[PDB]
Symmetry: C2
Subunit: 128 residues, 2 copies
């Protein structure tokens, strides 16, 4: 626990939280994602992606343009600090990243890149 | 216009009108739906479905459970007064229903039954 969190994205297009603070003593931080529900990945896919607030739009945009095969993310997009894979119902994925990639005083947002899902599936992350 | 309306569902999960009025003189009424943009049916499908405000949730829940192959609508759902098929970008569909299936003093709702979309895509229909 402490440097980790569990996120669930369901069939009603929602995440279970919209805010995450990362404790400044963490060297690394883990996100674990599971998709409750019965719908397939091609109709209700979810991933947890991270970037600063000012680049979220660019990532969602470039992400949509790359297709379901690239899990709706642009390959080697250097605005994406961290990201999971796109997962369907009953699947799960985890990502660990380096906390020194964040700095205190900058605003970060987590979100899903499936088309349209970022309207309700988005939230803040902050280094405290 | 005269006893019919032309409506659009776009790539942002938005319909372009959110209240429809049906005048009592009309024996029938027609709705013509188009979907501008470029996303396919499985990622951004849309339909126009009508029920009383009371049956919307029962219809939205059963439709999600019917699958993309059943155009996310329960077959022969007795609560649906009228509907179109589920279209992707570039496509189009229309429907004409009898105005005698509506009654004065009841509240009706139109919505898209694609999973996750009916929260953003809905509006009122009133018989005046
Ligand atoms: Cu999603
Ligand atoms: Cu829709």
């Amino acid at each position: 626990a402490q440097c980790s969190v569990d996120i669930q994205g369901n069939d009603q297009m929602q995440f279970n939280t919209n805010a995450i603070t990362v404790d400044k003593s963490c060297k690394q931080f883990t996100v674990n994602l599971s998709h409750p529900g019965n719908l397939p990945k091609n109709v209700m896919g979810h991933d947890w992606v991270l970037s600063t607030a000012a680049d979220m739009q660019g990532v969602v945009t470039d992400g949509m343009a790359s297709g379901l095969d690239k899990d709706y993310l642009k390959p080697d997009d250097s605005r994406v600090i961290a990201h999971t894979k796109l997962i369907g119902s009953g699947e799960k994925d985890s990502v660990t990243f380096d906390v020194s990639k964040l700095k205190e005083g900058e605003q970060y947002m987590f979100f899903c890149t499936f088309p349209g899902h970022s309207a309700l599936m988005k939230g803040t992350l902050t280094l405290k």
